[PDB]
Amino acid sequence: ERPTFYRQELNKTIWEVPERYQNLSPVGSGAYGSVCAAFDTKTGHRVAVKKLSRPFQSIIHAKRTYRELRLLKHMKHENVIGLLDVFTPARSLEEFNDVYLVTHLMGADLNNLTDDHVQFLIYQILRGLKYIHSADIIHRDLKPSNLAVNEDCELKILDFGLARHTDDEMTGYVATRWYRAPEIMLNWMHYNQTVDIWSVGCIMAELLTGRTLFPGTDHIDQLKLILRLVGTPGAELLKKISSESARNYIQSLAQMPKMNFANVFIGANPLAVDLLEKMLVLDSDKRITAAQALAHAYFAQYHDPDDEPVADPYDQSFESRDLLIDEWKSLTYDEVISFVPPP
Ligand SMILES: O=C(O)C1=CCCOc2ccccc21
Ligand SMILES: [Cl-]
Ligand SMILES: [Cl-]
Ligand SMILES: [Cl-]
Ligand SMILES: [Cl-]
Ligand SMILES: [Cl-]
Ligand SMILES: [Cl-]
Ligand SMILES: [Mg+2]
């Protein structure tokens, strides 16, 4: 049976939601969309409710809406954001126009530390990342503002199905670039899931020192900071930079050796230094993986190979499919009506 819906004026729009959701109030800066906090009377959770803005206005927007719903419906892991509910007030495909998504309300992020704290926080990021990567999903945007943390230090990874970041968003002295792997920052080559391990290394360093690792003022300044720490590329990696122009620019720089990480991260646990050296490798083929990193001695007090699960298979063949607006809309409607809530 369909629930009863009620209407309220929120975020310059009329919101129409099931009676179970009460005490709606706008929250956040708008970085993830148009979002309200609420109390869910069915589960007892404080929740975040997102109303999608013009979901089917173009082919690009319609496919992005379908992508967000597919990703959120798949993610079922303690250290990753999950979907509590999805709904529409429409009674048929013909009147379907708005989509609402519901998740747990998270109070703070990593921006808002003993060595034991660093162990637990990085362990949880890697546990969630092992799950994400087992489904052949690449996050691309791990950074402190995308990591929700509660009073008991428990952590969830955020940011799935939103618009790809623009060139302007990545320009200048901006946190949205400081965590990016060099091969994606400069479009050196076709990248893969190894980009996310670079980002984890940048996050871990910052928790240990209290300071951004590579706070570049622009793309080139940031590359210079990176190469000073990890060394200039050797002939093996240069061959793999398929961009002719990017390869030529790199060879204009004087060669530099990799620095001594024990003299950069002064006083840190030697096991933390060792792990950072294995994450912050310029050649992405040679970086440690999430599954390998969980078994590193730095995490000995938390690692349990019987409690680090992998994901069900995730079919993303739709990503290479060309459809019309109304076809993406119908696929999205089908995914709304088939949703089954978690236990
Ligand atoms: O990455 C996302 O899609 C979300 C992040 C948290 C804030 O907005 C959301 C609301 C509902 C479901 C998901 C999200
Ligand atoms: Cl209800
Ligand atoms: Cl609707
Ligand atoms: Cl951030
Ligand atoms: Cl992106
Ligand atoms: Cl030189
Ligand atoms: Cl699937
Ligand atoms: Mg993002």
Decide if 292 contacts 29 (C-beta within 8 A): no
Instruction: Indicate the SS3 state at residue 325.
Output: helix
108 half-sphere exposure, CB direction, 13 A CA radius: 9
List 85, 109, 152, 159, catalytic entry = 159
Structure tokens at 247: 């390869």
CATH classification of the domain holding 217: 1.10.510.10
Using CA atoms, how far residue 175 sits from 88, 165, 284, in Å, is 35, 12, 22
**159 catalytically annotated:** yes
CA 61 to chain CA mean position, Å: 20
Rounded distance, CA 269 to CA 258, Å?
A: 20
For residue 109, the cross-strand partners are: 148
Rounded distance, CA 231 to CA 282, Å?
A: 8
Rounded distance, CA 22 to CA 158, Å?
A: 24
Give the H/E segment covering residue 23.
strand 21-26
Q: Closest Cα partner for 30 from 12, 15, 9, 7? A: 12
Q: How many CB atoms lie within 10 A of CB 177?
A: 21
Rounded distance, CA 110 to CA 184, Å?
A: 24
Query: If you search the block for the tokens 């978690």, which residue do you land on?
Result: 342
Decide if 54 contacts 61 (C-beta within 8 A): yes
Based on its alpha-carbon atoms, the radius of gyration of the chain, rounded to whole angstroms, reads 22
Decide if 201 contacts 264 (C-beta within 8 A): no
Q: Ligand 1 pocket, 158 CB below 6 A? A: yes
Residue 177 Cα to ligand 4 midpoint, Å, equals: 9
Decide if 129 contacts 215 (C-beta within 8 A): no
Cited resolution, angstroms: 1.5
Structure tokens at 33: 């969309």
Decide if 194 contacts 284 (C-beta within 8 A): yes
Decide if 139 contacts 132 (C-beta within 8 A): yes
Nearest CA to ligand 1 atom 7: 32
Give the H/E segment covering residue 104.
strand 100-104
Residue 328 Cα to ligand 3 midpoint, Å, equals: 15
Annotated binding site for ATP: 27-35, 50
Query: Residue 196: what are its φ and ψ, rounded to 5°?
Result: -70, -30
Rounded distance, CA 99 to CA 112, Å?
A: 31
Q: Ligand 1 pocket, 71 CB below 6 A? A: no
Q: Domain range holding 287?
A: 108-299
Q: What amino acid occupies position 284?
A: S
Rounded distance, CA 154 to CA 108, Å?
A: 11
Q: Closest Cα partner for 282 from 248, 298, 259, 254? A: 259
Residue ranges of the alpha helices (H) in the chain?
Answer: 59-74, 115-134, 175-178, 182-185, 195-209, 219-230, 235-240, 244-250, 261-264, 270-279, 290-294, 325-337
Residue 17 Cα to ligand 2 midpoint, Å, equals: 8
Rounded distance, CA 109 to CA 228, Å?
A: 30
Helix count and strand count (H, E) for the chain: 12, 10
Q: Ligand 1 pocket, 81 CB below 6 A? A: yes
For residue 103, the cross-strand partners are: 48
Task: Tell me the ligand closest to 110's alpha carbon.
Answer: 4
Query: If you search the block for the tokens 């990480």, which residue do you land on?
Result: 261
For residue 104, the cross-strand partners are: 47
Q: Is 160 exposed, middle or buried (0-12, 13-18, 19+ CB in 10 A)?
A: buried
Q: Ligand 1 pocket, 35 CB below 6 A? A: yes
Task: Tell me the ligand closest to 329's alpha carbon.
Answer: 3
Rounded distance, CA 60 to CA 65, Å?
A: 9
